Coordinates of N, CA and C and ligand atoms in Angstrom, one line a residue:
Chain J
X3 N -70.4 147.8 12.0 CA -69.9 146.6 11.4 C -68.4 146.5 11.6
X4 N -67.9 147.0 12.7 CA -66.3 146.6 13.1 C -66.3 145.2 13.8
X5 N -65.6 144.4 13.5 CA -65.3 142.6 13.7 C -65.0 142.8 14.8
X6 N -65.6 141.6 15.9 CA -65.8 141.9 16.9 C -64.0 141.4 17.8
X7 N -63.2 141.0 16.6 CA -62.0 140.6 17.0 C -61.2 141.6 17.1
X8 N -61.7 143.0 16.2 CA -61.1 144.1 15.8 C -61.3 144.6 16.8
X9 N -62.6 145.0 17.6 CA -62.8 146.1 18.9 C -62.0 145.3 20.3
X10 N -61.9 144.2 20.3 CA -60.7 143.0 21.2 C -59.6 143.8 20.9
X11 N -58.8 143.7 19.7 CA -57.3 143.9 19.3 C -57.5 145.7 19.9
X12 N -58.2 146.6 19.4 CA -58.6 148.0 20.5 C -57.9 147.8 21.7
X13 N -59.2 147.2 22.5 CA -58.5 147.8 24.0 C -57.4 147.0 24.3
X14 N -57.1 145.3 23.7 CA -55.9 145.2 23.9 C -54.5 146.6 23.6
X15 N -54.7 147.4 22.6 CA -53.8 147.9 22.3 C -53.7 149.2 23.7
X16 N -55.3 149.2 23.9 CA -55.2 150.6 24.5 C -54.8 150.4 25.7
X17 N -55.0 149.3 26.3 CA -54.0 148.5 27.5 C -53.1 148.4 27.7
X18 N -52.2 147.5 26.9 CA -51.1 148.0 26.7 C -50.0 149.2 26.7
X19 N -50.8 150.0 25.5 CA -49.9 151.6 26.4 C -50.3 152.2 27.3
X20 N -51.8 151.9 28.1 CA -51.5 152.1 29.8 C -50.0 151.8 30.5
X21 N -50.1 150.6 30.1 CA -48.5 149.6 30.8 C -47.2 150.5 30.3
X22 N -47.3 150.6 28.8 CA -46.3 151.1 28.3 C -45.9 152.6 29.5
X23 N -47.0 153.5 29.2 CA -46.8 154.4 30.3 C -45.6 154.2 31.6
X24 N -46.6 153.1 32.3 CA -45.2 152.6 33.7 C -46.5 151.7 33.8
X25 N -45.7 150.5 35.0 CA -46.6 149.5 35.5 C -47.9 150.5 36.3
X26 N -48.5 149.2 36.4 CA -49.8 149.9 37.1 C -50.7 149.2 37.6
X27 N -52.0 149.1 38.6 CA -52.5 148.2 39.2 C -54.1 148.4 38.5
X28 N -54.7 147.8 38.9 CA -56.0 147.5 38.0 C -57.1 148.6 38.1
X29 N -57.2 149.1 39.4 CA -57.6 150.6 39.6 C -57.3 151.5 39.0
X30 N -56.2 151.5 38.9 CA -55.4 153.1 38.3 C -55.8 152.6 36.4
X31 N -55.4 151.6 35.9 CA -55.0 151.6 34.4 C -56.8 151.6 34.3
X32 N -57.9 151.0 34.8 CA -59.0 151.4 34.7 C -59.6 153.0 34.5
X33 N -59.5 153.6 35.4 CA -59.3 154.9 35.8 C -58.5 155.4 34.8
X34 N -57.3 155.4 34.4 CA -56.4 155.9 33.1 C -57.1 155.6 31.7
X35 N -57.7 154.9 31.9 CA -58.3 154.0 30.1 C -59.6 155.5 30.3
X36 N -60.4 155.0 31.3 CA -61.8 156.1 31.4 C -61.7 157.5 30.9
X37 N -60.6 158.2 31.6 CA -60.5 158.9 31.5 C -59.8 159.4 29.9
X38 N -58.6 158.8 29.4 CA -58.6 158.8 28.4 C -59.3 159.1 27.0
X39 N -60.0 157.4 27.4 CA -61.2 157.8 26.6 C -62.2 158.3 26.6
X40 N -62.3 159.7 27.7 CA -64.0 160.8 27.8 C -64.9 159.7 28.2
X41 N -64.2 158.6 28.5 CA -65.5 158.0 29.6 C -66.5 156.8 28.9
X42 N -65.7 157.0 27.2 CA -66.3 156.0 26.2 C -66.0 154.5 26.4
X43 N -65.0 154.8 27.1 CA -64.5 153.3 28.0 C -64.0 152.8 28.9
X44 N -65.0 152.0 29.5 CA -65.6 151.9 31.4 C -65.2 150.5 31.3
X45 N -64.2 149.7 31.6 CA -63.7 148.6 31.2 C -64.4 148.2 33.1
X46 N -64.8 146.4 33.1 CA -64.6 146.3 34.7 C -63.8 145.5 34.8
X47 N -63.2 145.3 35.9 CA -62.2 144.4 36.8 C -61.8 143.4 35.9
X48 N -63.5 142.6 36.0 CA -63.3 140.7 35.8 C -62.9 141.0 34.3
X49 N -63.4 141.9 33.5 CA -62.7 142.2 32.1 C -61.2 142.2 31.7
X50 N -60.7 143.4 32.8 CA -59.1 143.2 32.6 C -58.5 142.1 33.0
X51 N -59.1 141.0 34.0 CA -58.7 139.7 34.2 C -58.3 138.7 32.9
X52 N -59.6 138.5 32.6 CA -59.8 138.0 31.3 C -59.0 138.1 30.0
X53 N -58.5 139.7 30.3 CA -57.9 139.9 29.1 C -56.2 139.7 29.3
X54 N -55.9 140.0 30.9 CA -54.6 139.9 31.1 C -54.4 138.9 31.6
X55 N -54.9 137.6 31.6 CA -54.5 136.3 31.8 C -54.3 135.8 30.9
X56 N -54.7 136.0 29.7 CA -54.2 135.7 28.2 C -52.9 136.8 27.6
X57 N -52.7 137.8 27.8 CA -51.2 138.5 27.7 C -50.4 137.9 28.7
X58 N -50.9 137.7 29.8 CA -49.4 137.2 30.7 C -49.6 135.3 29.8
X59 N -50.1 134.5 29.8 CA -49.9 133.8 29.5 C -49.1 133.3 27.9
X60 N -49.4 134.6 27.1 CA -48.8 134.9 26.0 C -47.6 135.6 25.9
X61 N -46.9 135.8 27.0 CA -45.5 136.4 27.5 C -45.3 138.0 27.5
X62 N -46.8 138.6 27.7 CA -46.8 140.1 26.7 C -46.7 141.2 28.0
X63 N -47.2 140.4 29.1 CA -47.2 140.8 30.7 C -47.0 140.4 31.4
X64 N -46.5 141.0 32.6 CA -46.6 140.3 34.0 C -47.1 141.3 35.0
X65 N -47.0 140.2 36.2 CA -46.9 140.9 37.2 C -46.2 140.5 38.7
X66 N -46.7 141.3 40.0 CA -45.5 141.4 40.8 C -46.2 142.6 42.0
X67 N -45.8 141.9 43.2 CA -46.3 142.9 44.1 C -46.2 144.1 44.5
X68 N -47.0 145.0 45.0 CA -45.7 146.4 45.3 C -45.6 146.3 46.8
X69 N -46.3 147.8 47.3 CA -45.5 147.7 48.9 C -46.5 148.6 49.1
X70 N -46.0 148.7 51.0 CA -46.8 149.6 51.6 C -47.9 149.2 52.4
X74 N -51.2 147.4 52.7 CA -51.6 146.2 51.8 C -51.2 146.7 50.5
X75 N -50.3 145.4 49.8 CA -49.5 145.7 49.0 C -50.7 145.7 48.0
X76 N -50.7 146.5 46.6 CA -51.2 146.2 44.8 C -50.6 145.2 44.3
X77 N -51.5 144.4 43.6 CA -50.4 144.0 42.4 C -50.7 144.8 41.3
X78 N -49.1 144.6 40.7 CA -49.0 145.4 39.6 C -48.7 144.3 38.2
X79 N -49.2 145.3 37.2 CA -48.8 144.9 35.8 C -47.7 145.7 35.0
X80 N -47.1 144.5 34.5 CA -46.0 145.4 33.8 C -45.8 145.0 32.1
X81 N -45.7 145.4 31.4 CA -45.3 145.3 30.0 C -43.8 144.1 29.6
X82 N -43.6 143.0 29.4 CA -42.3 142.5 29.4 C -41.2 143.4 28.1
X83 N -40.4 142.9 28.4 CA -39.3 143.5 27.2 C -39.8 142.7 25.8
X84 N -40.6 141.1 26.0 CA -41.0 140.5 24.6 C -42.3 141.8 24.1
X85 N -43.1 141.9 25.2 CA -44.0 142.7 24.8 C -44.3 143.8 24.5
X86 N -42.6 144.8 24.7 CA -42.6 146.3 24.6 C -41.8 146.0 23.1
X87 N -41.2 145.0 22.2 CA -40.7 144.6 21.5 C -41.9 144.5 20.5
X88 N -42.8 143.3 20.0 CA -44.0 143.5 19.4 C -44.9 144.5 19.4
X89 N -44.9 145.3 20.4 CA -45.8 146.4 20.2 C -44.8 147.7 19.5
X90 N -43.8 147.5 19.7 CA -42.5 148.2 18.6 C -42.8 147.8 17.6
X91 N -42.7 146.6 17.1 CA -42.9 146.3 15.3 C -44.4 146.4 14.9
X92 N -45.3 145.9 15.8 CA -46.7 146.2 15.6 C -46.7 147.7 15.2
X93 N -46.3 148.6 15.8 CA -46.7 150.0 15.3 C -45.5 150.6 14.0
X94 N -44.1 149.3 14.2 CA -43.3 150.2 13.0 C -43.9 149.8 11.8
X95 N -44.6 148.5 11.7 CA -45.2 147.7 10.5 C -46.4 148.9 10.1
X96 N -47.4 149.1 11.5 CA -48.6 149.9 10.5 C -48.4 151.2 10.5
X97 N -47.0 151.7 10.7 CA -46.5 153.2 10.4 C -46.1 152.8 8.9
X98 N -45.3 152.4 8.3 CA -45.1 151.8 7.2 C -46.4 151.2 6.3
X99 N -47.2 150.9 6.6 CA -48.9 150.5 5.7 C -49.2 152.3 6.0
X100 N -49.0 153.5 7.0 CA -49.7 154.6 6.5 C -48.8 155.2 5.6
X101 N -47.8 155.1 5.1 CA -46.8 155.6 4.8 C -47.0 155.5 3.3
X102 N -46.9 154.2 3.0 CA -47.8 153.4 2.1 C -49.0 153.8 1.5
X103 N -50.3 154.1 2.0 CA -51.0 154.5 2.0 C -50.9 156.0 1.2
X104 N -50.7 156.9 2.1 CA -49.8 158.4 2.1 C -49.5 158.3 0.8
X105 N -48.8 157.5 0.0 CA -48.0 157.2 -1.4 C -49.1 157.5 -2.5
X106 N -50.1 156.4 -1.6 CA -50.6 156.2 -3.1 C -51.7 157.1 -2.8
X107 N -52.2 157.9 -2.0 CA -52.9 159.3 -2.2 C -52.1 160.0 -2.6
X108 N -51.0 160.2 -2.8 CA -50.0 161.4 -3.9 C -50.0 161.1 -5.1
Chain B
X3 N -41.4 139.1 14.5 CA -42.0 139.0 15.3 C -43.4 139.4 15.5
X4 N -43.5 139.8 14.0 CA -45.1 140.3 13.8 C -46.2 138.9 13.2
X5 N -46.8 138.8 13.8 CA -47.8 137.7 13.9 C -48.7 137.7 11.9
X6 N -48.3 136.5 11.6 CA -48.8 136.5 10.4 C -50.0 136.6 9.2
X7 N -51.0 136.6 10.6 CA -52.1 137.3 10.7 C -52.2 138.9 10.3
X8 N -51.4 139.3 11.0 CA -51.4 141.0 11.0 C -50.8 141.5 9.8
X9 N -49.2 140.7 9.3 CA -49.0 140.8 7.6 C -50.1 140.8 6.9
X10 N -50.5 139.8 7.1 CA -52.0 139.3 6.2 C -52.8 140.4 6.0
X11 N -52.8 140.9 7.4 CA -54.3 142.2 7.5 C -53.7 143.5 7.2
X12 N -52.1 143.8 6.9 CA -51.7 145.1 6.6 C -52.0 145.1 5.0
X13 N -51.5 143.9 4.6 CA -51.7 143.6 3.0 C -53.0 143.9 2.4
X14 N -53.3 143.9 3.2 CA -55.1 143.8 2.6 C -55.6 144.8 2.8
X15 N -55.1 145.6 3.7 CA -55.4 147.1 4.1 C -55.2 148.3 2.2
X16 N -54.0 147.7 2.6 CA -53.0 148.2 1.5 C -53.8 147.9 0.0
X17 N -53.9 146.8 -0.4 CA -54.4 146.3 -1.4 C -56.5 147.3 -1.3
X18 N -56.7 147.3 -0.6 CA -58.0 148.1 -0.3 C -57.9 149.2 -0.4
X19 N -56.9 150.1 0.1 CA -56.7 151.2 -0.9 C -56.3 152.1 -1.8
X20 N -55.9 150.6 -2.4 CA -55.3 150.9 -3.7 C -56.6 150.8 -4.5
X21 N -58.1 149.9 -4.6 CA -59.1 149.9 -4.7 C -60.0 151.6 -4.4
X22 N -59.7 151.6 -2.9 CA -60.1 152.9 -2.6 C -60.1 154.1 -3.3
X23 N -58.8 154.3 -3.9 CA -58.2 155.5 -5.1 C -59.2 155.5 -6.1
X24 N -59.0 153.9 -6.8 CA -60.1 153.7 -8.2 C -60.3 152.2 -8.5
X25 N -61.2 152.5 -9.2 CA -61.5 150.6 -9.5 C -60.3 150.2 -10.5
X26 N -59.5 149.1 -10.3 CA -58.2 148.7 -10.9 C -58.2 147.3 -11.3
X27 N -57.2 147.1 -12.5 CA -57.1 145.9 -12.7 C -55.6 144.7 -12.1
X28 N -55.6 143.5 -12.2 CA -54.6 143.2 -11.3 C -53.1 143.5 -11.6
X29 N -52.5 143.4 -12.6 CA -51.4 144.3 -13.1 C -51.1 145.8 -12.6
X30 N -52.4 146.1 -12.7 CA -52.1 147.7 -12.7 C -51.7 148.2 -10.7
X31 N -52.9 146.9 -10.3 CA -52.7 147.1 -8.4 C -51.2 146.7 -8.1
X32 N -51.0 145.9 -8.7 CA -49.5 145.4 -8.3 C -48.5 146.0 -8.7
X33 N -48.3 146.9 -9.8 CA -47.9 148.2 -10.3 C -47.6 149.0 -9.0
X34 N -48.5 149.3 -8.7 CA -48.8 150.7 -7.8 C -48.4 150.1 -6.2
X35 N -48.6 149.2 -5.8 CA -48.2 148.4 -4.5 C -46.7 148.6 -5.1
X36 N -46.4 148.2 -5.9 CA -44.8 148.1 -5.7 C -43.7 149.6 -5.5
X37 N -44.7 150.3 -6.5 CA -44.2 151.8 -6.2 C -44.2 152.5 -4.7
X38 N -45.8 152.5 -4.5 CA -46.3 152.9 -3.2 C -45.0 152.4 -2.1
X39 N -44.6 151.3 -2.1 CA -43.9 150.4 -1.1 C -42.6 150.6 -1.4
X40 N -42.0 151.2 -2.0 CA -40.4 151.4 -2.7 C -40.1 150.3 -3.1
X41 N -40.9 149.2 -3.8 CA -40.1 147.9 -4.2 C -40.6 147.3 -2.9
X42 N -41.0 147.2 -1.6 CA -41.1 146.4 -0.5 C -41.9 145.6 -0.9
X43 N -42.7 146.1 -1.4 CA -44.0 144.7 -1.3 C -44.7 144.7 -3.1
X44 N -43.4 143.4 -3.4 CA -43.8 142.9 -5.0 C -44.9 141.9 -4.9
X45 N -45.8 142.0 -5.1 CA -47.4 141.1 -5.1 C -46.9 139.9 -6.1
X46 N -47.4 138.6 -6.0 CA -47.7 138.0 -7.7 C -49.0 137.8 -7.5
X47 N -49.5 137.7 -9.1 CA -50.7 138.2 -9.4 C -51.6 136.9 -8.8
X48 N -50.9 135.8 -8.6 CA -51.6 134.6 -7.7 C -52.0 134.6 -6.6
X49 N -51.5 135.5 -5.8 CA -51.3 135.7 -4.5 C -52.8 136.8 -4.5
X50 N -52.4 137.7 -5.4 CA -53.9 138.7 -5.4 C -54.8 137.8 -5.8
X51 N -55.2 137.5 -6.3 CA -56.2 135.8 -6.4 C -56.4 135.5 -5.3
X52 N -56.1 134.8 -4.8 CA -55.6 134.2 -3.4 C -56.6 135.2 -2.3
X53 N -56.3 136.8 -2.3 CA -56.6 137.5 -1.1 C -58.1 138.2 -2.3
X54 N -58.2 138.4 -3.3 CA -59.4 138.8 -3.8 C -60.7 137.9 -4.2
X55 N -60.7 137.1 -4.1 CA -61.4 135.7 -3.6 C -62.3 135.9 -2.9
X56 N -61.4 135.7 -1.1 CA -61.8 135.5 -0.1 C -62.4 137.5 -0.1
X57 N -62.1 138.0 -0.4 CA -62.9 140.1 -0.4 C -64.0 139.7 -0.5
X58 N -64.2 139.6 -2.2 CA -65.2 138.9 -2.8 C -66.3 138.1 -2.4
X59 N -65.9 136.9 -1.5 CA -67.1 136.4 -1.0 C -67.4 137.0 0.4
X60 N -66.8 137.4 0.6 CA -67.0 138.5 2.3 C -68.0 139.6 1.7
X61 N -67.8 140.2 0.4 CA -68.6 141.2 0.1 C -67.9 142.3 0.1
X62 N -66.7 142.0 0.2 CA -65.9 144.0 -0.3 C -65.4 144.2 -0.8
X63 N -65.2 143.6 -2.4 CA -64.7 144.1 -3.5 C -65.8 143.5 -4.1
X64 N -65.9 143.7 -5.9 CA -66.0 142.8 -6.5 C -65.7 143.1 -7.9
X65 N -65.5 142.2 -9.2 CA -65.0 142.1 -10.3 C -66.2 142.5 -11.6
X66 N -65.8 143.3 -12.6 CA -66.3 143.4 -13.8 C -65.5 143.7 -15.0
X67 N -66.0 143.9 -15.8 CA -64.9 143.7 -17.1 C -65.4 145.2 -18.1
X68 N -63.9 145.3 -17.9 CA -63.2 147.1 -19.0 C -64.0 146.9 -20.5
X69 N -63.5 147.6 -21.1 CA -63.4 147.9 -22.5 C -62.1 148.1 -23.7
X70 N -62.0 147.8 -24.7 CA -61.6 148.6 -25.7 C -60.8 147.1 -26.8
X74 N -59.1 143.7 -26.3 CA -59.1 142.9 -25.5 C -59.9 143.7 -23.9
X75 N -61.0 143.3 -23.2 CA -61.4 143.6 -22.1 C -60.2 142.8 -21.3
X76 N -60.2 144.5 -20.1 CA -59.4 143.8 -18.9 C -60.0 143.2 -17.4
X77 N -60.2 143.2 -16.5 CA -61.2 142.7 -15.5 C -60.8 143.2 -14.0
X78 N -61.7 144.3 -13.9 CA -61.5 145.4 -12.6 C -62.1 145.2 -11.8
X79 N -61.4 145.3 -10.1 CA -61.9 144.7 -9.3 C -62.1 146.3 -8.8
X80 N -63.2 146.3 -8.0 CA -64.1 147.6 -6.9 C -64.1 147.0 -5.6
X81 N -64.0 148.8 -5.0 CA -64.3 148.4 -3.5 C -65.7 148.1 -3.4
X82 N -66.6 147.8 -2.8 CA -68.2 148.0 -2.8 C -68.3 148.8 -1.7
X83 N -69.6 149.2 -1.8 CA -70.2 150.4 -1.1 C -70.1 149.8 0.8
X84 N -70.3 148.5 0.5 CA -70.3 147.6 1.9 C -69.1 147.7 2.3
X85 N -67.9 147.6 1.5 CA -66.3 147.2 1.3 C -65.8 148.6 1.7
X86 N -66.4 149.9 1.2 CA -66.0 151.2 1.8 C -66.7 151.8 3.0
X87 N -67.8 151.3 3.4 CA -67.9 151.5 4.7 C -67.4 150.7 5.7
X88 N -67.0 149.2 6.0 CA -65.9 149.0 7.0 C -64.5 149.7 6.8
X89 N -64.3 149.5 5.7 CA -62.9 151.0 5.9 C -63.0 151.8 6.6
X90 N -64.2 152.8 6.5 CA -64.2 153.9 6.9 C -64.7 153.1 8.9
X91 N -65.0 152.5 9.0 CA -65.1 151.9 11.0 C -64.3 151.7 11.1
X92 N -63.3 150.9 10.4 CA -62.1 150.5 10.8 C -61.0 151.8 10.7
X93 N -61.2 152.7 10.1 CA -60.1 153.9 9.9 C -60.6 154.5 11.3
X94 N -61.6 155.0 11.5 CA -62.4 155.8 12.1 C -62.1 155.0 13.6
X95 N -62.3 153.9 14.0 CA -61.7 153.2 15.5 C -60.7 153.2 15.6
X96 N -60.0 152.9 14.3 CA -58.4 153.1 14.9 C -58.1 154.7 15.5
X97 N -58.5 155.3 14.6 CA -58.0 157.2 14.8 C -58.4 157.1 16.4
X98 N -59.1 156.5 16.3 CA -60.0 157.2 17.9 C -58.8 156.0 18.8
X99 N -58.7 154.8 18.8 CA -57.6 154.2 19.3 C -56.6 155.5 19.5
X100 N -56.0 156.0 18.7 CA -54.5 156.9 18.1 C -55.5 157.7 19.6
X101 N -56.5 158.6 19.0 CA -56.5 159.4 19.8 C -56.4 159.6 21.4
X102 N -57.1 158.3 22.0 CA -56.5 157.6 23.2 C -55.4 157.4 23.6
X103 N -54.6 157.1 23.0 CA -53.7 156.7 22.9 C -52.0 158.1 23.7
X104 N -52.6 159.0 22.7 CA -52.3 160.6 22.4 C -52.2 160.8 24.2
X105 N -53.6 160.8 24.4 CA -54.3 161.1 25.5 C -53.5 160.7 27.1
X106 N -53.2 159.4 27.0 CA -52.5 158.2 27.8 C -51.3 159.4 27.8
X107 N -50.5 159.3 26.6 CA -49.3 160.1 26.4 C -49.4 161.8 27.3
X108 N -50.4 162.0 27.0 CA -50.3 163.7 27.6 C -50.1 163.6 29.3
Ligands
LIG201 C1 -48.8 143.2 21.4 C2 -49.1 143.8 20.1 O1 -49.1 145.2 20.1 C3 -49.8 145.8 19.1 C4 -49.8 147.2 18.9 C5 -50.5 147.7 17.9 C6 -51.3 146.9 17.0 C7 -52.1 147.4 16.0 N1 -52.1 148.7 15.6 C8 -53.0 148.8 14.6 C9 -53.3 149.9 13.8 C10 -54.3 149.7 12.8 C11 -54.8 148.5 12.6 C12 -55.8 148.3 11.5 N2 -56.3 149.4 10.8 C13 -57.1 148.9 9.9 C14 -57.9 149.5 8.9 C15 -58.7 148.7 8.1 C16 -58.7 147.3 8.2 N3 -59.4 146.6 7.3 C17 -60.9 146.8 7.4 C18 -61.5 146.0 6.2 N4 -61.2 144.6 6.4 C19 -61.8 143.8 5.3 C20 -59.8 144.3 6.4 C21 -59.2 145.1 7.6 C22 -57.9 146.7 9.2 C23 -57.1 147.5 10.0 N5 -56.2 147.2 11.0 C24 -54.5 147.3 13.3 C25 -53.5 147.5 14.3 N6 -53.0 146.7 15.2 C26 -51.3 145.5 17.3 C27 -50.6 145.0 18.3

């Protein structure tokens, strides 16, 4: 019974600090998530499409070619490494909180 | 820069386990929120109205009445403490991903 917007806001997050990591191309941050998570999470392609056309359109990512047939890569913007800063200083603060009132 | 939504849903986190501790009445939750929080987060008792309402008809709190002038205690429900516990329990595992990415 976890809301299905809740297991969404998940792998957005867990995405995200793939990027946070360093940029990365769709192969690799797939592969990084898998492994991660013991294999509990097998994300495919057209998925991270879906999900990173709505972050880059929401200013949270981009991307940009590399080198060498080139990858594209994804990158975290400075708006995005910014809210994901307050997003985690806010719910350090709610455990903190929390932490309180179990004392 | 934190989406108002997510205030919304740390508040309620918060307010849930202050519930979680023990069944409380509205005075007394907003008592303890203010301590818990150093003063950060003074509730009015309208506002808890406002968010124990909407628990209520979702099914994860609900209200009955004290003893000795009766005062009127709101509970987590047994429904109300098992999404806590999915929602505590996916985040950890989020964290623990997360950990993982980091190593
Ligand atoms: C780019 C942004 O970057 C972001 C980075 C992190 C987060 C983020 N980190 C989180 C950590 C925990 C939670 C969270 N933990 C919860 C525990 C319980 C609940 N309850 C469960 C019961 N129902 C009724 C209310 C919610 C919600 C909860 N929400 C949300 C979180 N969101 C969001 C955006």
């Amino acid at each position: 019974e976890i809301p299905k917007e809740m297991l969404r806001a998940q792998t957005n997050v867990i995405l995200l600090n793939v990027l946070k990591q360093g940029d990365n191309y769709v192969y690799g941050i797939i592969k990084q998530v898998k492994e991660a998570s013991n294999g509990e999470m097998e994300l495919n392609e057209a998925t991270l499409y879906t999900i990173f056309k709505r972050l880059e359109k929401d200013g949270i990512i981009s991307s940009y070619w590399g080198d060498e047939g080139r990858r594209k890569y994804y990158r975290l913007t400075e708006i995005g490494h910014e809210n994901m800063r307050l997003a985690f200083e806010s719910w350090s603060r709610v455990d903190k909180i929390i932490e309180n009132l179990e004392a």
